[PDB]
Ligand binder design. Structure first.
Ligand SMILES: Cc1c(Cl)cccc1OCc1cc(=O)n2nc(-c3ccccc3)nc2[nH]1
Length: 135
């Protein structure tokens, strides 16, 4: 089939987190924005309309929404208000998402395992891991 849609579509709620504060600190986020954003723990929604995929946070201070096609670079405005160039691709059934800005780079992997969606964020040496369940 084209089984990526069934694996990823839905509303996902955070259930665990490691080193996200560190990851945000590395990305440049300030001390107040980090703490609040880290507590916010928004649900994240994935939808699909043809070739166009959309990832939205539910309402949180610092709403976000991207809409993209696999392989096509696109401008994104992150939750900490960075203007980045993002490319997302499907490699192994993992969604790999690279953001470039100011000669810097961060990679965000999103993979299904069992009934769970695991999100790994890497910036320089600093690796964050967050796990989500269907809400
Ligand atoms: C929020 C944020 C801040 Cl303040 C700063 C830097 C990066 C951020 O986001 C990075 C980031 C964090 C995170 O928990 N997830 N969770 C998803 C997700 C989960 C399920 C379904 C679809 C997407 N995508 C991400 N990417």
């Amino acid at each position: 089939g084209s089984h990526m849609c069934d694996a990823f579509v839905g509303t996902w709620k955070l259930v665990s987190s490691e080193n996200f504060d560190d990851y945000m600190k590395e990305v440049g986020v300030g001390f107040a924005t980090r703490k609040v954003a880290g507590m916010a723990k928004p649900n994240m929604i994935i939808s699909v309309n043809g070739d166009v995929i959309t990832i939205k946070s539910e309402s949180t201070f610092k709403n976000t929404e991207i809409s993209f096609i696999l392989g096509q670079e696109f401008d994104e405005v992150t939750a900490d208000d960075r203007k980045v160039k993002s490319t997302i691709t499907l490699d192994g059934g993992v969604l790999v998402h690279v953001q470039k800005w100011d000669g810097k780079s961060t990679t965000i992997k999103r993979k299904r395992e069992d009934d769970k969606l695991v999100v790994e964020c890497v910036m320089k040496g600093v690796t964050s891991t967050r796990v989500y369940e269907r809400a």
